[PDB]
Amino acid sequence: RVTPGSLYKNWTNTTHTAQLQQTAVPLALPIFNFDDISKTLNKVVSYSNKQYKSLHHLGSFKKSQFNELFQKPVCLVREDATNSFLKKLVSHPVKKFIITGEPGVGKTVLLSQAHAYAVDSKQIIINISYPELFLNGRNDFSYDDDLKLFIQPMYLKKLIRKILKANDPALLKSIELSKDYKFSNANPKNASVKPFVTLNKTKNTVLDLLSVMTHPHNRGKLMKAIIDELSVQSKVPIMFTVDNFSKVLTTAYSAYRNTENKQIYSLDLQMGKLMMDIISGETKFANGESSTILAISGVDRTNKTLPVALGKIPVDPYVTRYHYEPKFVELLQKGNVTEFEVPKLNKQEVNELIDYYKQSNVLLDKDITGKKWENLIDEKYFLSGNGNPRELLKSLVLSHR
Amino acid sequence: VGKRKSSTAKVFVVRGTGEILVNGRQLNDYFLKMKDRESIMYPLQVIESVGKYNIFATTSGGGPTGQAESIMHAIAKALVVFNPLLKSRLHKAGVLTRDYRHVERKKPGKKKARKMPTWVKR
Amino acid sequence: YRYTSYVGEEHPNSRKVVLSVKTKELGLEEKSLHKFRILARSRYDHTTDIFKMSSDKFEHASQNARYLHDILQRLLAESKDLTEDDFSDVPLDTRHTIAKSLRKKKRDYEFPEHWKRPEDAPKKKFDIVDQLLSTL
Amino acid sequence: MNVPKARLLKVAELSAKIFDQNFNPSGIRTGSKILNERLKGPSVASYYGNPDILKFRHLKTLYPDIEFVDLEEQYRLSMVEAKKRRGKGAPKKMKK
Amino acid sequence: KIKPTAEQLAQWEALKSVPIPPRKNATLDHITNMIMRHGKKEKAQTILSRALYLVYCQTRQDPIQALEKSLDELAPLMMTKTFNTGVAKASVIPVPLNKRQRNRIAWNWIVQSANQRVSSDFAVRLGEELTAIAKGTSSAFEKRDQIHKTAIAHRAYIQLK
RNA sequence: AAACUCCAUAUAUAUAAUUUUAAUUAUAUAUAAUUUUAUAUUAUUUAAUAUAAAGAAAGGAAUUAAGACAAAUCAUAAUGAUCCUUAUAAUAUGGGUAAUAGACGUGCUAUAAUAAAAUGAUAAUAAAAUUAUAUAAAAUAUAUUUAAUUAUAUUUAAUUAAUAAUAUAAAACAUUUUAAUUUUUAAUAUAUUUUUUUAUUAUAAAUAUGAAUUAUAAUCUGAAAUUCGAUUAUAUGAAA
Numbered sequence A: 001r002v003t004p005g006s007l008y009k010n011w012t013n014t015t016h017t018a019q020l021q022q023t024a025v026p027l028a029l030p031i032f033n034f035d036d037i038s039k040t041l042n043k044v045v046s047y048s049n050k051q052y053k054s055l056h057h058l059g060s061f062k063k064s065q066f067n068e069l070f071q072k073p074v075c076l077v078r079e080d081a082t083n084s085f086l087k088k089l090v091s092h093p094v095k096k097f098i099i100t101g102e103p104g105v106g107k108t109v110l111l112s113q114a115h116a117y118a119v120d121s122k123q124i125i126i127n128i129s130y131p132e133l134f135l136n137g138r139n140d141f142s143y144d145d146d147l148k149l150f151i152q153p154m155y156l157k158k159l160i161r162k163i164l165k166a167n168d169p170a171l172l173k174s175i176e177l178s179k180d181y182k183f184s185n186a187n188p189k190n191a192s193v194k195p196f197v198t199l200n201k202t203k204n205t206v207l208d209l210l211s212v213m214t215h216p217h218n219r220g221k222l223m224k225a226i227i228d229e230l231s232v233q234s235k236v237p238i239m240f241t242v243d244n245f246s247k248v249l250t251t252a253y254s255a256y257r258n259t260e261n262k263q264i265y266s267l268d269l270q271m272g273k274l275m276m277d278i279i280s281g282e283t284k285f286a287n288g289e290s291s292t293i294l295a296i297s298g299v300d301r302t303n304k305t306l307p308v309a310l311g312k313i314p315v316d317p318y319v320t321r322y323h324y325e326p327k328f329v330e331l332l333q334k335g336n337v338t339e340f341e342v343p344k345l346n347k348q349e350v351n352e353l354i355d356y357y358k359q360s361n362v363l364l365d366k367d368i369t370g371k372k373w374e375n376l377i378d379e380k381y382f383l384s385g386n387g388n389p390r391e392l393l394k395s396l397v398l399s400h401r
Numbered sequence B: 001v002g003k004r005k006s007s008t009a010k011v012f013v014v015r016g017t018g019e020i021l022v023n024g025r026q027l028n029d030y031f032l033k034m035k036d037r038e039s040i041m042y043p044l045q046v047i048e049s050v051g052k053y054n055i056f057a058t059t060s061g062g063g064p065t066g067q068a069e070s071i072m073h074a075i076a077k078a079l080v081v082f083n084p085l086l087k088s089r090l091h092k093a094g095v096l097t098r099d100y101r102h103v104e105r106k107k108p109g110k111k112k113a114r115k116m117p118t119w120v121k122r
Numbered sequence C: 001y002r003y004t005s006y007v008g009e010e011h012p013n014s015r016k017v018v019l020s021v022k023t024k025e026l027g028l029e030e031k032s033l034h035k036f037r038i039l040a041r042s043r044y045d046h047t048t049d050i051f052k053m054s055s056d057k058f059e060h061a062s063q064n065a066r067y068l069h070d071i072l073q074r075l076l077a078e079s080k081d082l083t084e085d086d087f088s089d090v091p092l093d094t095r096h097t098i099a100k101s102l103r104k105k106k107r108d109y110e111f112p113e114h115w116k117r118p119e120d121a122p123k124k125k126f127d128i129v130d131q132l133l134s135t136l
Numbered sequence D: 001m002n003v004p005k006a007r008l009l010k011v012a013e014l015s016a017k018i019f020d021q022n023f024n025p026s027g028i029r030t031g032s033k034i035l036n037e038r039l040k041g042p043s044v045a046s047y048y049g050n051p052d053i054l055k056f057r058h059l060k061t062l063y064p065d066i067e068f069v070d071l072e073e074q075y076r077l078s079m080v081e082a083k084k085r086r087g088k089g090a091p092k093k094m095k096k
Numbered sequence E: 001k002i003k004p005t006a007e008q009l010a011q012w013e014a015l016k017s018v019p020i021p022p023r024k025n026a027t028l029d030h031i032t033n034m035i036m037r038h039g040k041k042e043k044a045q046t047i048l049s050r051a052l053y054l055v056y057c058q059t060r061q062d063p064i065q066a067l068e069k070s071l072d073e074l075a076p077l078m079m080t081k082t083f084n085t086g087v088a089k090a091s092v093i094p095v096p097l098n099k100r101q102r103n104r105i106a107w108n109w110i111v112q113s114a115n116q117r118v119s120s121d122f123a124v125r126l127g128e129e130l131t132a133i134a135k136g137t138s139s140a141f142e143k144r145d146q147i148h149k150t151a152i153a154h155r156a157y158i159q160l161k
Numbered sequence F: 001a002a003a004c005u006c007c008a009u010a011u012a013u014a015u016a017a018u019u020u021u022a023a024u025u026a027u028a029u030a031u032a033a034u035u036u037u038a039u040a041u042u043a044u045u046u047a048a049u050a051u052a053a054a055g056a057a058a059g060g061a062a063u064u065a066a067g068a069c070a071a072a073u074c075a076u077a078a079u080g081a082u083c084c085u086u087a088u089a090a091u092a093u094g095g096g097u098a099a100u101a102g103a104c105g106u107g108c109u110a111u112a113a114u115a116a117a118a119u120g121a122u123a124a125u126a127a128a129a130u131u132a133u134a135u136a137a138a139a140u141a142u143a144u145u146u147a148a149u150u151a152u153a154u155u156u157a158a159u160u161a162a163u164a165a166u167a168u169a170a171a172a173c174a175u176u177u178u179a180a181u182u183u184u185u186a187a188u189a190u191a192u193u194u195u196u197u198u199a200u201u202a203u204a205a206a207u208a209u210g211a212a213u214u215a216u217a218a219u220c221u222g223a224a225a226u227u228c229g230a231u232u233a234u235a236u237g238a239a240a
């Protein structure tokens, strides 16, 4: 008893997935570029078209945000938060960050900005938004024999596709291969004719490698090969990113069960192990400017692990595996992860946001009409808990109290 | 010091730019319900002085909404010292009144305070 | 050694005696101190560096006190041994203390020092008759 | 628990040796909780009262000079006498 | 001796003209209370505000105001209240309605019409219904019209007149 | 009857070397209101409404008279009369009070998405009360490959108590999931909705509700758990 047009989903899903961004005012806002941050240092800025294209593919813009409020997802540049982070990324020798903060402070937004910057500066981006998919057991998996770990060839395929599409092909096909690669063919065409697909050293490309389509049991092998290729190449920078890395840290054991009924460890998987290797000084990328940018989510569980990894708490040895996994900490220490605290909004920034919202026509009538502007701003600041952006946004729009 | 239900809120209000700290942590972190935050703000909102006064609240006892109400009550009293002419206005707004609403005890024969067990005729 | 006595009554808690010492105040070297603390286990609190223990096993209070003393002496002897038993590589178990802390409440938070306004404080108001009076 | 198990066990054993408390690493039913329970008998016995309490009988022993009267007893005796009089006295008890 | 300072006096004067701000939008609060069941007001509030957000998204104009307008439209200005009438014919009379009663009648109808919509989440259903009413389509309107017609019959049954 | 009374409230004073700390408290002693004042608008100097300024000022408990109902109690206990005195008095071992056609009250749990379940350790937020016929912390072991949870066992740290324990309150709020529901899934492509979209293929009246009833295995208390107790596990999964 359902039509195509009617809304059948729950609220959060509906807001994400039903395009109510359709009925919205076009806004001629400035464009996000790191080279011209001096112009737009503390102003709202729409992303470039190319950036948007890349960012959507990656999975930067998420469901629980209020990206439905505008024509397209929008951020502002911040001197204390985003700009400083970008500068650190540019300058630091290690280039290896974990974006920490309170729930709703704007970690994902920071990640999205970092991605956009990377896109601008001719870099490949391997984004893993929501590791919950590979960590929790809701897709097929298999123990590979060559690689001593469990591969996940539904998730992997999706990730490969994202990598292919998020990045431009000219940058991606500038990379020649280091080794030759045999794979099992899995086209609808040439199934009987071509039993195997072969990629040569100099002739073939990374783009071509990505476009390969194998059976599930070779997908993990393909992924491994791709990563190796990217590590080897020194022509283009590789930005690796993992958002909701908190889940990964806490969920040490996956929901998958091996032959004997017991839970599989995250490092015994392909994806989680690979990710950990990337984080640590192990799969070292040949080029400079090649970063790993991790991000915590307030959604996920909290425990002693991440604080212990960083310069926060001394290592209590007696706390349990559930609330403190030491292997993960050790791995984090190995690859010198310098954490980045996202600061809460200043008064001026809050004011600027409120002004933008007013321009876009999100503010309620009781806020605008018959009220001093400065007083309103102060109230908004108070209700957000002194500049938590999400909370502020909620107070503005989702209050109706 | 303000009170409501079982809650008690000792609140240090000071002239610095308007930031909040409830019980040694951020306001949005402590009070999750926006209503409680709005209530807390209200003494500063009846005056045009939200943003003017720094507030350091310290609560104990009761639940969250009651705690927030006790904080609000305390803040109004604190404000009254800064400018005595606004005291009447605050009273009119309904912030200077200590909300007496006290939880009624369970009486013997009754199940709860008022809720009696079912009656029968036959 | 704290002793308790119920005056008119004959309580069975009058026998209870409680020894209690700060572990740093005990005459020990650093290695031996750590070993002593390890041996104490739940009896040693780490936030306050205090080790206490009570005995109710024996009939009289004096007996119980003597027993506690003997235990303490034994503990000290063990701490000062060091022959084929150091306990350098067993970290201090602080689980009981954290459990106790959780059970209780905390008021660790304080008023921010940079939020203070000495300039806004009420200055001394000039009372002329009081000044006149003060001839001493 | 990165710290080893055997060392912890040894430490626990040592602690047990130091104090009087026993060291049961295997976790077997020893029977310790049966004996170690404080015996509650004297308190239980002392429930109804002190059986040696002064009675009316004694108020003759202590003070022979004062001719006391137990009123309830006297009443009972009077009732018995009345019963005897009106043919409602107790029947004579069988011996066999 | 009171001794009020100049700045304080100026502040008081500035305040004096401004009226005391209201702590709640009353009609909204009433609605939230009606939605609410087991002293779980927060959940009811979340539901209501989410619905209003959805409404706004669908049609970009103040959601609260639109809701109030809808209530005003829908709320029947009077009701044909039944009476025993001294043990005789149950002679009905038109009776004027308090604001709350008016909006209460409207809300129940709105809820009913929402419950016919598809989604699992009630908040979504509610929002869709509110948007439909804003645009101008419901059986609630028809019911109101019918009520008004029934009130119109029994003109002079009103006692004081 | 009201009032004095108790609880709770507001204020003041006293005391607490602010390690028995919660001073945001506890407890003795006061004071405080069955609130006051004024301007008007109706009805006749007053009384209800409204407005204003002054106040923290707003409840609950106990107390339920005379008479009556030959209301209830001789099974709390006692006493009158009457009846039993090798028995209608007294002690032990077992059984019964828990029997089951229909019926009648009180409750509890339910019949799923404005509502259920997983999770949430710099442990979100209480109060009141108990612990020498005790309260039992941490930790080890087994159920259970990690560990947590829950349940037992092992063994008693602390305190007979503003000091330790019962006891990290729970809803809340947040992520995840949820059949009925082809209102979803997964194979392909697809893309500026990517924890997602579109296209084309295949996905065909009690559940992934409920927890009655029963089977087996363990555990707990006790000397003893068959009639007849309480847990846990693996199955069973009515009715609604």
Ligand SMILES: Nc1nc2c(ncn2[C@@H]2O[C@H](COP(=O)(O)OP(=O)(O)O)[C@@H](O)[C@H]2O)c(=O)[nH]1
Pocket (backbone or CB within 6 Å): A064, A065, A066, A074, A075, A076, A081, A101, A102, A103, A104, A105, A106, A107, A108, A109, A110, A296, A297, A298, A299, A389, A390, A393
């Ligand atoms: N920094 C920043 N954040 C914003 C901006 N606009 C919205 N946000 C908010 O940033 C939030 C993302 O915070 P995040 O740290 O991902 O929340 P978490 O997932 O709970 O950790 C969203 O909820 C947005 O509402 C902006 O312009 N800048």
Ligand SMILES: [Mg+2]
Pocket (backbone or CB within 6 Å): A107, A108, A243, A244, A296, A297, A298
């Ligand atoms: Mg996130």
Ligand SMILES: [Mg+2]
Pocket (backbone or CB within 6 Å): F002
């Ligand atoms: Mg009276």
Ligand SMILES: [Mg+2]
Pocket (backbone or CB within 6 Å): F018, F021, F022, F023
């Ligand atoms: Mg204190």
Ligand SMILES: [Mg+2]
Pocket (backbone or CB within 6 Å): F065, F066
């Ligand atoms: Mg009477």
Ligand SMILES: [Mg+2]
Pocket (backbone or CB within 6 Å): F070
């Ligand atoms: Mg009778």
Ligand SMILES: [Mg+2]
Pocket (backbone or CB within 6 Å): F070
């Ligand atoms: Mg009678």
Ligand SMILES: [Mg+2]
Pocket (backbone or CB within 6 Å): F074
């Ligand atoms: Mg009798």
Ligand SMILES: [Mg+2]
Pocket (backbone or CB within 6 Å): none
């Ligand atoms: Mg009798």
Ligand SMILES: [Mg+2]
Pocket (backbone or CB within 6 Å): F089, F090
């Ligand atoms: Mg007998």
Ligand SMILES: [Mg+2]
Pocket (backbone or CB within 6 Å): none
């Ligand atoms: Mg019975």
Ligand SMILES: [Mg+2]
Pocket (backbone or CB within 6 Å): B117
């Ligand atoms: Mg009854």
Ligand SMILES: [Mg+2]
Pocket (backbone or CB within 6 Å): F112, F115, F116
């Ligand atoms: Mg349910």
Ligand SMILES: [Mg+2]
Pocket (backbone or CB within 6 Å): F138
């Ligand atoms: Mg324990």
Ligand SMILES: [Mg+2]
Pocket (backbone or CB within 6 Å): C103, F164
């Ligand atoms: Mg305690």
Ligand SMILES: [Mg+2]
Pocket (backbone or CB within 6 Å): F168
């Ligand atoms: Mg908890």
